[PDB]
Every structure is written in structure tokens, then in C-alpha cells.
């Protein structure tokens, strides 16, 4: 009771890697005389080899000093490997500070096995270099970098990344410039782009005649060409774009940016439309570059985002509309104060028709997520409390409220400045935030009061999204969540109606449901025509990257809508584009194979929920249709040999008869034992001495 | 809690007036009725347990979609009109429904029953994986499977083994529960089996142990019941009328098919009759692993030694073999069963079935 109550309420973290840590350092969690009582259990299970039942009593007492004293002699491999899947969570609560104090004893020895899983999860600087010390094979150092680079989370933005990615010659560092491209989505994403040329499906691309019909003509080309490069249709005819004017010209050029996605340099081909005559033509160029460079902060071999950042300055409107929205996508993973310093005075007056600052709240959320900055924390906090300029309407108030409900993830003591803005103005989405602060601060979740308390407020749109994230890691509230999702689907306001399909579309890939598609039938005509115009596009968001199969019931609903008017001809094209989006095969991944969570994919869901509402109530901008591409993760399963470089090798079959390096597949395991941390996705395999083969 | 304090609390205060008009129609002396037929004119048929069958008008309380023929509702002593519907969460509507998605049993874990796998795989997995092969021949793949033998070996293992490779949800329905306690629910439970599994249909329906309802005798009276014919006649129309690509599957189990209704068989819809095969060394070790897990055994006790010399016993005698081995330790007052008790109990059960087969034949 002394160590539990002292380690319960605190503003700091828990655990230390120092060898002289008795857990008496700093704040005193327990008396000095009572410390020897916890060590009395160590000599008991030491000779008896009771480590199986010794961990059971170690997690209940919550003592960080007991673990490093228990492990002394004999084998550090089999004994420590059992603690990998046992120690961190047996009980519903999560204590991550136990494995941190045991690093000092292993520092002189460690092992090839237990030092692997220590580099992921918390990911301390001493844990990553620990496995590199006992590994004398440069091949095994490569495999350890694939699971770490895909984790992102803590270390993302500039000042950490690309500084380590340079590299030198040493045994304790060994980060190659090629490993950053192989581990991270750099080289492998380009092979999938070229491999789609042979596997491409039929194309609906047509240019028609009239400019009113050229808007839907070029717009569908952006969805069809995702992951595909077609230079024949764009270069041969330049009239299918320029004929569009107003807000349609910006969305037409953005479709070309999807062609150049995952390319070395996409700015050269888009330079022709960068400056011609009219600002409306110049506006679409900025939105197209952000789509082509989305997913990579530094590019591949060159930082192509250096020139894009300098184009944000402009007194005009249509260009500034696509400058804030277009650039707020490709900058994920790269933090710079030059774009923040220029955007701060523009977002002060927040005038929609002139400066078009309404998208500044969504741009700052997708870029700076998972970063540490004192400039954006202080400036937005003062502007929110002062309520300066003309700000009155709740629309812009909810933008700054939901923008600050993101950046504080992965912070700790920096969250206290954000909490002042949350408790200032009450919001329906900010009531559930107070109980979710302990998720990131206490390093994990699953307590009774951290889940069930969210279900009482539901029986607005932010609380239902958090249920899907907690149910993936809990076997209790997961079964009862299926019933609560059906009652929240029918409600007066449209905010909760539009949130459910976005959350169910990810769950429904492996679990189709008839009740979800049947609601979308009556979801079209309800009250206002704005819901009907948004209903056609909402039914395509769930079927993105999938055709026929389970969607055959949903496909019949979109076939009855062709053209009911001049505008309906364009609206129905948005449904056909998402159906064939990515040549018919795509996916949505909110997590990775490292058993962690990415704050970028989570921030893209909250950003998409705020935007995209142009056809629905609260008209903002028609350029928000491309927001979905910011959160779409690639789908591939790689394979490697002992050389570490990409090479053709055969693995287990997928969903198409063989899977090579750079070919599409998802959720496929392997029976071959790898070197270090055999998992899904990219892995370096090996062959047993029994049979000798090159495949 | 905090969010709903400013929402639900002022909501119930404004909705209190509508609740006062309800209770006036509700009334204190309520009763439980029984539905028969629902018509769009707001009229129904209700019965209280003393059987005064009435006919009354349906008032406005809840949507008609919540009302289903054959259910229980609420009544009042004045006009005997329906004042509300009774909650069905406590009383199960079907007989026995257990939904098992992606079970543990597979084709490789059932032992030497592979001879039975080749027959069930062609009638289940083959039309599901490659439905286009039957379109060229213009034939309907049989959705039914007739199982023989005793439970615990052939019927229990193979039932859940087919759902693993086909990625199907296992539904176990007791066959002796097809006549359930009430008159008029025969055609209702038959539709609920195909209705729940008809929307999605990654599922295979399983039925076992029918000794009764398959026999209509010579009439529905003089010892017979009308509930027997309600389920049998409706099951024939639902199985023959409903055709699909091989998603929905219904598999029954019976020891003797001579007593079943030949009209219910409907030849050509179910072409699959699977016999019972004897377990090999692999299957017998699976039954022993369940009982010997909690049973105490020394390091000299091996599952391969017991199955080496055996009379090839069924699942009932194998379970009784380990049962008799435990009595030898109780008479000697010991908690640890040695290897001699398993060998001694194996010979006793083996000699209780077949020994000399009445030696003869010259």
C-alpha cells in the first residue's frame, strides 16, 4: 500500500535505468527498512526456479527493484524470453517501469534474444544500442531496423530523424543511408508503384467535351491513378484541366499529383502549372505537390519539400486556400518553424473569404502531431483564451479545440499547458478528453474507469471513436461494443451519423455486416438535400479499395444514381472513383506489425472528420475530398535474404500464387524461423541446414 | 455521467408528460398474452394461460417491427387489448443456438478420419471456394450431410472441423429440442435458423440426435403431437426452396435413417451420406489427452503404449478405460496413478466387448 499509493498519483513517469536505483531516489515510494522485505522473495524462487510464479507476485506488489535482483546467473536467454510476453501485462493495469530497472544488470551481458523486444515499445536510447552490442553479424542489425523505423511515435520530426540516418562506421551505431530507404517506406513503395502496371485493372478515364463535364473527367483520374503513373493522358491533352475554373480548377490539378505520388521528384512535371497567368490556375499546383510528396518527409534521395514550403506566402485567396490545405499533408514527419511563423499572422484574423485560415487548424494538427514545440503551444493557447479578432461563431472555436486535442499525445509534462484550453470552453467532444489524458501519460490503458466511464456518456463523435481503439486491446468491452455501435447510429445531428461509417469501414474489411449497408439506403433522403449529396460520397468511403465480393450489396445502391441534374453527374463520380480507388485493391491500417500505435494515422481520422463536410452542413471548401489520401497506408509484404538487399525469393502464398519483394499482400505469417524478431511484413528469412535451396 | 447529466436529466423532465398518458392506458392488473396473427388493421389474437382465446385491437405503443407472431405481449382486464410487448431477452426464442466462429477443430486434428474429410470437403468447401465449377455442369451441390456413429469421435470432431478451413461459424442445434413446449412455434423456429444465418452466412448449421420428430407415425393424433408436423413440414420447404452459392449449410445427425420421413429427405437436394469410420492411433490419443490431463500419471505413462494393443474401442469405452483406472488408486488410497493401472483397466474394458466371438465355424 505504500509503494502503490505513492506511484499512483504523479506528474512524472516511472522507472530508471541507473544501477544505483533502489526506488528510493527522488520521491520516496517506500521506507528503507521495508525495502529489504521485497528482496526476501528473491532467494526463494532463485534456487527453486519459480520464475513462472515469481512474476505473478512481482506485478501485484508493484516493485521495480525486485526484477533486477532476481536474475543473476545460469541462462539469460530462456529465462528472460518468458518475461517478454508475461511481465508487461498480466493484470488489466500496465506497469512498464519494471523492465527499465533490469537493464543495469544486463548491461555487461544482455543476450541476443531478450535485447530485441526492448528496443520497441518504450524504445529507450540505451535499449536500442543494447542489442547492437551482443550482435556481431551486420545482417542481424538490418532486421532490427525494420521494426524500429515502422514504429515512428516518439522519434519522428526533424532534429532526430535524418541526423541518425546519415551514418558512420562503428559497431555500436551502424545506421546506413540505404537502411533508412529499405526499412522506411521509401524504396519498397516505388516497386509497388511499378508492379501495378502489369496488375492494373480497366480504366474509366474519359475527357468528354464540355468544361462542366471536364471537372468530373479529370477528378476520377486522381482516384484511378493512385499508385500508378500515367504520363500519356495528361501531357497529350492539356485542355482537360485549364477549362475548369473557380474551386474546380484546384481539385483538377490535384488529381495529377496522385499520378506522381511515391516518385523521386514530382515538382518538375508540376512546374508547368505552377505559374502561368491566373491565380486560380496557380492554386491547384500547391495542392497537387502535397499529394505527390505525402507519406515521406525527406523524400527519397532529395528533400523536395524545401521549395514547396517557400510558396505558402501570398496575399491572394484561392492560392492560400490550397497552400494551407495542400501543404498540411506532405509535411507529416517534418517540423519547421518557418511555415508556423508565416501561418500565425494569417490565422489570427481567421477571415474565410480573404486569408482563408479556416484550414489552418487542420494543417497544424496533421503536421506537428507527435512533436514538441513551444511556439505553437503558447501562441494558440493565448489566442484561444483571449478570443481576439472577430472570432464569435462556434465553427472556428471547434477548430482550435480539436486541433489542441491532438498535439499533446506523446508529451507528458507538456500537456498541462493544453489542459487549460480544454477546461476553458466546454464542448461535447472535450468531456471525454479529461478521462483519456491518462492513456498517453501512464503509458497504456485498460483500467476499469478508463473504459466503462466512456460508455455512460454515449448512452459526441469523439467518444465513440475512442471505444474502437480500446476494444482492440481488451477482450471485455469488445463484445459489448457491437451493441452500442448500433444505437448511436440513429441520432438527430449529422456529426455522429458520419462518424460511424468511418470507424466501421476499418472493422468491416474482415467482418461484413448487413445492418451497416442497410442504414445507408435511408441515409440519402432524410431532411436536407445536403445530406443526400453527401450520402453518395459517404457510401464510397467504406468501400475504398474493394470491389464486388462483400460489396455486391453496396454496389447496387450506387448503381441507381447516375445523373439527376448537372451537379448530380459530378457527385455520382465521387462514388465510382472510391470504388476503383487504387485499381480496386487497397486497405486501411491504423496500426503496424510492431504492436504499437501511430499518432499520424490517428490524427488523420480526426482531421478527416472535421473536413470533408463540404457537401454536408457547414460548407467550407471543395478541396477536402483528397483528405482521405493522407491517412491511407501502403499494403505490401516484403521478403529478404541473408544479403539484406531486395532479391527475388519465394514465401508462403497470399490471397497471386506467389509473393515476391515489392508485391501486394496483407496479414500473412510464416513458419520459417528468422534471425531476430520474426513477424509479418518485411523479414529476413533463413534456411535450415537440413534442406539446401535458394528459394 | 457528466455529459448526460445536462442532456438526459432535462430530457426526462420534458418527456414526463408523455409517460403519464402511457401509465393511464397501462394499468396495474396486467397479464401475459400470446400472439397468433398480426394484421395491418391494428388487430391481433391474444390468450392468457387459462385459455380464453380472444380477438382484440392493437393500440399504439411500440413499432410493429418489434411484434412477431407467436410471441408474448401485455394485456389489460377491460378490453383485453394489447398494452405492450413482453421482452424476449429472458426467454430464448429458438431451441438451442450456440454461435462458434472459427472453431479449434480442423481437418488435421481429427486423426484418421480423412476418409470422411474427402466426402465432406467436396460437398462443403468445394462449392464455396470454386462455385464456378458447378455452373458449367448446371448442378446443385448438396448442402446437407448425414452423419453416422456415436458422438465424441465422428460426430463431435467432424462437425467443428469443417468450419475451420471453410472459415464458417459453427451453430449447434439439439435435435431433441425441435418440439419445444409450445404449440404454433413450429414454423417460426424453422425460419429463424435461416434468417439469422441468412444475412451474412459464413456459417454451417449442425443438428444432432433426432430420435423422434422424424417419425410422424400414421397420424397426428392417438399419441402424436401437432408440433412434430409443424417443424418437419416447414423444414422441407425452407431447405428445398432456399438455394445459394454454398454459404448457408445445414448438417443433421442420426443413427438410423429408416425411421425418418422419406418426403423430408427430398432426394437430390442432399446427396451426401457419410458412414462411420474407426479411429486410428492418432484419434485415440486425442481422447486420452483430455482425460489424462487432469488425471495423475507418472513419467512411465505414455499414450502410445495404451493404443498399441487395443480392441479398437469407440469414444464411450475409451472414456470408461481411464475411469476404471482411477478406481484402483482410490481402493489403494493413493493420489498418483501408476502405469500398471492403465494396463489393468485396459484389459477389463477390452474383455467386456469382443473376445472369442463364440468360437466356431469348424
Amino acid at each position: 500500500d505504500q509503494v502503490e499509493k505513492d506511484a499512483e498519483d504523479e506528474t512524472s513517469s516511472d522507472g530508471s535505468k541507473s544501477d544505483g536505483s533502489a526506488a528510493t531516489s527522488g520521491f520516496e515510494f517506500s521506507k528503507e527498512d521495508t525495502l529489504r522485505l521485497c528482496l526476501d522473495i528473491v532467494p526463494y524462487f532463485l534456487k527453486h526456479n519459480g520464475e513462472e510464479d515469481a512474476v505473478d507476485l512481482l506485478l501485484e506488489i508493484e516493485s521495480i527493484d525486485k526484477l533486477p535482483q532476481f536474475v543473476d546467473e545460469n541462462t539469460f536467454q530462456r529465462v528472460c524470453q518468458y518475461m517478454v510476453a508475461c511481465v508487461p501485462l498480466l493484470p488489466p493495469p500496465e506497469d512498464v517501469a519494471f523492465l527499465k530497472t533490469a537493464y543495469s544488470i544486463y548491461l555487461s551481458q544482455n543476450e541476443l534474444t531478450d535485447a530485441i523486444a526492448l528496443a520497441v515499445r518504450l524504445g529507450e536510447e540505451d535499449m536500442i544500442r543494447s542489442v547492437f552490442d551482443a550482435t556481431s553479424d551486420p545482417v542481424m542489425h538490418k532486421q532490427l531496423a525494420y521494426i524500429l523505423a515502422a514504429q515512428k511515435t516518439s522519434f519522428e520530426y526533424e532534429g532526430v530523424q535524418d541526423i541518425i540516418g546519415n551514418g558512420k562506421l562503428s559497431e555500436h551505431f551502424l545506421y546506413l543511408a540505404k537502411e533508412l530507404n529499405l526499412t522506411g517506406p521509401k524504396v519498397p513503395e516505388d516497386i509497388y508503384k511499378s508492379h501495378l502496371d502489369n496488375s492494373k485493372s480497366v480504366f474509366s478515364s474519359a475527357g468528354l467535351d464540355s468544361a462542366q463535364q471536364n471537372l468530373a473527367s479529370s477528378f476520377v483520374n486522381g482516384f484511378l491513378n493512385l499508385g500508378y503513373c500515367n504520363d500519356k493522358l495528361i501531357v497529350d491533352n492539356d485542355n482537360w484541366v485549364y477549362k475548369t475554373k473557380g474551386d474546380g480548377m484546384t481539385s483538377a490539378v490535384a488529381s495529377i499529383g496522385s499520378i506522381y505520388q511515391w516518385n523521386l521528384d514530382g515538382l518538375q512535371q508540376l512546374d508547368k502549372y505552377l505559374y502561368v497567368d491566373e491565380p486560380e490556375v496557380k492554386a491547384g499546383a500547391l495542392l497537387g505537390i502535397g499529394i505527390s510528396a505525402s507519406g515521406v518527409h525527406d523524400g527519397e534521395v532529395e528533400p523536395a519539400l524545401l521549395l514547396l514550403q517557400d510558396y505558402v506566402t501570398n496575399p491572394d485567396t484561392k492560392i492560400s486556400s490550397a497552400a494551407i490545405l495542400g501543404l498540411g499533408i506532405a509535411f507529416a514527419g517534418s517540423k519547421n518553424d518557418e511555415v508556423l511563423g508565416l501561418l500565425l499572422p494569417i490565422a489570427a484574423s481567421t477571415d474565410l473569404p480573404i486569408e482563408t485560415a479556416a484550414m489552418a487548424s487542420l494543417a497544424l494538427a496533421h503536421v506537428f502531431v507527435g512533436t514538441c514545440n513551444g511556439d505553437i503551444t503558447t501562441s494558440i493557447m493565448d489566442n484561444f483564451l483571449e478570443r481576439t479578432a472577430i472570432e464569435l461563431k462556434t465553427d472556428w472555436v471547434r477548430f482550435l479545440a480539436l486541433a489542441l486535442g491532438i498535439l499533446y499525445m506523446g508529451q507528458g509534462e507538456q500537456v498541462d499547458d493544453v489542459l487549460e484550453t480544454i477546461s476553458a470552453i466546454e464542448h461535447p467532444m472535450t468531456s471525454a478528453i479529461e478521462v483519456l489524458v491518462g492513456s498517453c501519460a501512464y503509458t497504456g490503458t485498460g483500467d476499469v474507469l478508463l473504459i466503462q466511464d466512456l460508455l455512460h456518456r454515449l448512452t459526441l463523435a469523439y467518444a465513440v471513436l475512442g471505444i474502437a481503439l480500446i476494444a482492440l486491446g481488451e477482450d471485455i468491452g469488445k463484445e459489448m461494443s457491437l451493441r452500442h455501435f448500433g444505437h448511436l447510429m440513429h441520432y438527430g445531428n449529422e456529426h455522429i451519423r458520419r462518424m460511424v461509417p468511418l470507424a466501421m469501414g476499418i472493422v468491416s474489411v474482415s467482418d461484413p455486416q448487413m445492418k451497416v449497408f442497410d442504414t445507408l439506403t435511408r441515409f440519402s433522403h432524410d431532411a436536407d438535400l445536403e445530406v443526400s449529396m453527401n450520402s453518395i460520397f459517404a457510401m464510397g468511403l467504406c468501400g475504398a479499395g474493394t470491389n464486388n465480393a462483400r460489396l455486391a450489396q453496396l454496389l447496387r445502391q450506387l448503381a441507381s444514381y447516375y445523373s439527376r441534374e448537372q451537379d448530380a453527374l459530378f457527385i455520382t463520380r465521387l462514388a465510382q472513383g472510391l470504388l476503383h480507388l487504387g485499381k480496386g485493391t487497397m486497405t486501411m491500417d491504423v496500426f503496424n506489425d510492431a504492436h504499437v500505435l501511430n499518432k499520424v494515422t490517428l490524427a488523420s481520422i480526426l482531421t478527416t472528420a472535421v473536413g470533408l463536410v463540404s457537401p454536408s452542413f457547414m460548407l467550407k471548401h471543395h478541396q477536402l475530398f483528397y483528405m482521405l489520401n493522407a491517412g491511407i497506408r501502403p499494403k505490401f509484404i516484403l521478403a529478404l535474404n541473408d544479403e539484406g538487399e531486395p532479391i527475388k525469393v519465394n514465401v508462403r502464398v497470399g490471397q497471386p500464387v506467389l509473393l515476391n519483394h515489392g508485391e501486394r499482400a496483407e496479414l500473412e505469417t510464416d513458419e520459417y524461423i528468422s534471425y531476430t524478431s520474426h513477424i509479418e511484413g518485411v523479414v529476413i528469412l533463413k534456411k535450415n541446414p537440413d534442406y539446401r535451396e535458394e528459394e | 455521467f457528466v455529459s448526460n447529466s445536462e442532456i438526459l436529466k432535462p430530457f426526462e423532465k420534458k418527456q414526463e408528460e408523455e409517460k403519464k398518458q402511457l401509465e393511464e392506458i397501462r394499468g396495474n392488473p396486467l397479464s401475459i398474452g400470446t400472439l397468433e396473427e398480426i394484421i395491418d388493421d391494428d388487430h391481433a389474437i391474444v390468450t392468457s394461460p387459462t385459455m380464453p382465446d380472444y380477438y382484440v385491437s392493437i393500440l399504439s405503443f411500440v413499432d410493429k417491427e418489434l411484434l412477431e407472431p407467436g410471441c408474448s405481449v401485455l394485456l389489460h382486464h377491460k378490453t383485453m387489448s394489447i398494452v405492450g410487448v413482453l421482452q424476449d431477452d429472458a426467454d430464448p426464442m429458438v431451441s438451442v443456438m450456440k454461435m462458434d466462429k472459427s472453431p479449434t477443430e480442423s481437418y488435421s486434428d481429427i486423426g484418421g478420419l480423412e476418409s470422411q474429410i474427402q466426402e465432406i470437403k467436396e460437398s462443403v468447401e468445394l462449392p464455396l471456394t470454386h462455385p464456378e465449377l458447378y455452373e458449367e455442369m448446371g448442378i446443385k451441390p448438396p448442402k446437407g450431410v448425414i452423419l453416422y456413429g456415436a458422438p465424441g469421435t465422428g460426430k463431435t470432431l467432424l462437425a467443428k472441423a469443417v468450419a475451420n478451413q471453410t472459415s464458417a461459424t459453427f451453430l449447434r442445434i439439439v435435435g431433441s429440442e425441435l418440439i419445444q413446449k409450445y404449440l404454433g412455434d413450429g414454423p417460426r423456429l424453422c425460419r429463424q435458423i435461416f434468417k439469422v444465418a441468412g444475412e451474412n452466412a459464413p456459417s454451417i448449421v449442425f443438428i444432432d440426435e433426432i430420435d423422434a420428430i422424424g417419425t410422424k407415425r400414421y397420424d397426428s393424433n392417438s399419441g402424436g403431437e401437432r408440433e412434430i408436423q409443424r417443424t418437419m413440414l416447414e423444414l422441407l420447404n425452407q431447405l428445398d426452396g432456399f438455394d445459394d452459392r454454398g454459404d448457408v449449410k445445414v448438417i443433421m445427425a442420426t443413427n438410423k435413417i429408416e425411421t425418418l420421413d422419406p418426403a423430408l429427405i427430398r432426394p437430390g437436394r442432399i446427396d451426401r451420406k457419410i458412414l462411420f469410420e474407426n479411429p486410428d492411433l492418432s484419434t485415440k490419443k486425442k481422447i486420452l489427452g483430455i482425460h489424462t490431463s487432469k488425471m495423475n500419471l507418472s513419467e512411465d505413462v505414455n499414450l502410445e503404449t495404451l493404443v498399441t494393443t487395443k480392441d479398437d474401442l469407440s469414444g464411450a469405452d475409451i472414456q470408461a478405460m481411464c475411469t476404471e483406472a482411477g478406481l484402483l488408486a482410490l481402493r489403494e488410497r493413493r493420489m498418483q496413478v501408476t502405469a500398471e493401472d492403465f494396463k489393468q483397466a485396459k484389459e477389463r474394458v477390452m474383455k467386456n466387448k469382443v473376445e472369442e466371438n463364440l468360437e466356431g465355424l469348424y
Binding site: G492, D526, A527 | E18, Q21, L22, E24, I25, Y54, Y55, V56, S57, L59, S60, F61, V62, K78, T79, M80, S81
Partner: peptide, 29 residues
Amino acid sequence: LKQTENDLKDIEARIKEKAGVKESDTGLA
């Protein structure tokens, strides 16, 4: 908007069902 019209069928009509239906059901139907 449509939430009131959904319950309106079971509220406004219930007032007419008090006098109208009970009179038609008089006589223990």
C-alpha cells in the same frame, strides 16, 4: 427533426385510441 414524427404516431393517436378504440371494443371482444 424526424425524431418527433417517429414518436408522434404513438402519442397523438393514443389520445384518440382511448375513447375511440375502447368504445369499439366494448362488450369483451
